[PDB]
Amino acid sequence: TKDQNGTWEMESNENFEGYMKALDIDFATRKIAVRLTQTKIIVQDGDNFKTKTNSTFRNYDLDFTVGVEFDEHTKGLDGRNVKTLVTWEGNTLVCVQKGEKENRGWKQWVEGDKLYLELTCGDQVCRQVFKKK
Amino acid sequence: TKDQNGTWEMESNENFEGYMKALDIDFATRKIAVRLTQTKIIVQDGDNFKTKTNSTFRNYDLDFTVGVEFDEHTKGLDGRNVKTLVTWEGNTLVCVQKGEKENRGWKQWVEGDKLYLELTCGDQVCRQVFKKK
């Protein structure tokens, strides 16, 4: 369990295209989706997380409590319904999104002044690194 | 998420024999264990649980935080090592104990003044009901 509070600015974004393609996001949207400057702001008070992921293309905003299962409607990305659970595995925040897509979820951890995020769907992995602002 | 604090006295215990047999507990321990009354004490503050399951023969203490994965050594039962995770699925507390035994875990919920606990291992289900004191 560890502190992830802050404003985080993207410095690296690997294979976001493969990730979206595994989610069957159409070609035209993928071409305008891959933003290289992105800000993630996280407010974490105990088990409650309030996050905003902002780019010039679109914003995703996600609120959740660690250990409480919830239904997520992935509107604005692939628009599927999934049952999501976020828990701690040591100091790594782990999310599983159960539904039609195998191996769908993400892992997020802070190491020094950087936040690392791995997004997975099937056999695709996208890795992003952010620096605390 | 819901409140499960209190001292609970066992009312009913169905198929506890089958559950222990699926865990390979020896016949002589099973004969003694199946006839005993159990008292469960739960102290819950937020996501941290401190629990005691007591009988005249043997007791089992177990503390955990909801949504935090941990290593459980099931000492005094079958003595195996399992990775345990307890989460909320509505107002049911759900536990998965990952390891050699398939479908091992439990679900616990409160309806008024009774606590219901369903324990699973393989294809065996044990149903227990307690009443608050």
Curated annotation (Swiss-Prot), chains A, B:
GO terms for cellular component: cytosol; nucleus. It is found in: Cytoplasm. All-trans-retinol binds at K40, Q108. One of its GO terms (biological process) is retinoid metabolic process. One of its GO terms (molecular function) is fatty acid binding. Forms a beta-barrel structure that accommodates hydrophobic ligands in its interior. This is Retinol-binding protein 2.
